[PDB]
Design an enzyme around this catalytic site. Structure first.
Site, mmCIF file in Angstrom:
data_model
loop_
_atom_site.group_PDB
_atom_site.id
_atom_site.type_symbol
_atom_site.label_atom_id
_atom_site.label_comp_id
_atom_site.label_asym_id
_atom_site.label_seq_id
_atom_site.Cartn_x
_atom_site.Cartn_y
_atom_site.Cartn_z
ATOM 1 N N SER A 132 0.830 -1.223 0.000
ATOM 2 C CA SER A 132 0.000 0.000 0.000
ATOM 3 C C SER A 132 0.863 1.272 0.000
ATOM 4 O O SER A 132 1.604 1.517 -1.000
ATOM 5 C CB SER A 132 -0.936 -0.064 1.198
ATOM 6 N N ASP A 178 -10.183 -4.573 -3.379
ATOM 7 C CA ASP A 178 -9.618 -3.690 -2.432
ATOM 8 C C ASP A 178 -10.367 -2.376 -2.193
ATOM 9 O O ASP A 178 -10.701 -1.571 -3.106
ATOM 10 C CB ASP A 178 -8.248 -3.370 -3.101
ATOM 11 N N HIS A 210 -7.673 -5.606 0.310
ATOM 12 C CA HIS A 210 -6.449 -4.760 0.434
ATOM 13 C C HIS A 210 -5.391 -5.445 1.273
ATOM 14 O O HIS A 210 -4.203 -5.198 1.171
ATOM 15 C CB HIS A 210 -6.863 -3.441 1.097
#
Ligand code: CA
Length: 260
Positions: A132, A178, A210
């Protein structure tokens, strides 16, 4: 013209890459928060076998710690890599700060870790990966360091969408469901922006959140290791898994510049 000098481990199969560990038993060494300059410390995973390997730094995301990516750093080290899963200076650090810290962590493995670690690193064959915002940091560091051999942003987040100057082989793994770093605003725009002739691929995990990168996942494992094998080790025995690559299945979409 010879045997590839970076080749490590047996001729791979899908099942070997999907399994929980590779062929190298691994040991750990702490990068202490009290001894790391420029990042928050971490855990170095390294093959017990005394040989040289590629060195890989892995960043967690926002509010994350080294424990959310540890499985991956261990899994990858056990295929013949020296890998550091880091903590960031604060859990709230943004992508570009994570890019600086992924950079500090590579320097650490190379200059500050113990002899046992430093001795197993080929200092010229480095790679980064990130989840991320760690993933955004990976893109940024890949953009600033053409000398890295691979970059693997996992469900990446970054406000900058244009990564036009990246020339380092980059696999971007996306997660179809996600809800936090949507492929439509993050992974795809990043991938779409990397121009020819840069090698690259975009794999989107089917049915995945995610947080898929923070839990043992055979698809992230198999494809991350194939990618690092093909590009950090120049190990062409791994091209067969990336080219033509996964049918689209565990994989929502796969794009690539195969055969690289
Ligand atoms: Ca689907």
């Amino acid at each position: 013209q010879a045997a590839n000098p970076y080749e490590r481990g047996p001729n791979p199969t899908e099942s070997m890459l999907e399994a929980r560990s590779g062929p190298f038993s691994v040991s750990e060494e702490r990068a202490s928060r009290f001894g790391a300059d420029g990042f928050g410390g971490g855990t170095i995973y390294y093959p017990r076998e005394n040989n040289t390997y590629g060195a890989i730094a892995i960043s967690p995301g926002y509010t994350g710690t080294q424990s959310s990516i540890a499985w991956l750093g261990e899994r990858i080290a056990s295929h013949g890599f020296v890998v550091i899963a880091i903590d960031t200076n604060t859990t709230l650090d943004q992508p570009d700060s994570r890019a600086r810290q992924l950079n500090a962590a590579l320097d650490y493995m190379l200059t500050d870790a113990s002899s046992a670690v430093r001795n197993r690193i080929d200092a010229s064959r480095l790679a980064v990966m990130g989840h991320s915002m760690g993933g955004g940091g990976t893109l940024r560091l890949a953009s600033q360091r053409p000398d890295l051999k691979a970059a693997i942003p996992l469900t990446p987040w970054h406000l900058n969408k244009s990564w036009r100057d990246i020339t380092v082989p980059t696999l971007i793994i996306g997660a179809e469901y996600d809800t936090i770093a949507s492929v439509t605003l993050h992974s795809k725009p990043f991938y779409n922006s990397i121009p020819s002739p840069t090698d690259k691929a975009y794999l989107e995990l089917d049915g995945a959140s995610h947080f898929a990168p923070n839990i043992t996942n055979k698809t992230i494992g198999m494809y991350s290791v194939a990618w690092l094998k093909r590009f950090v080790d120049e190990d062409t025995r791994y091209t067969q898994f990336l080219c033509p690559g996964p049918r689209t299945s565990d994989v929502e979409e796969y794009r690539s510049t195969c055969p690289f």
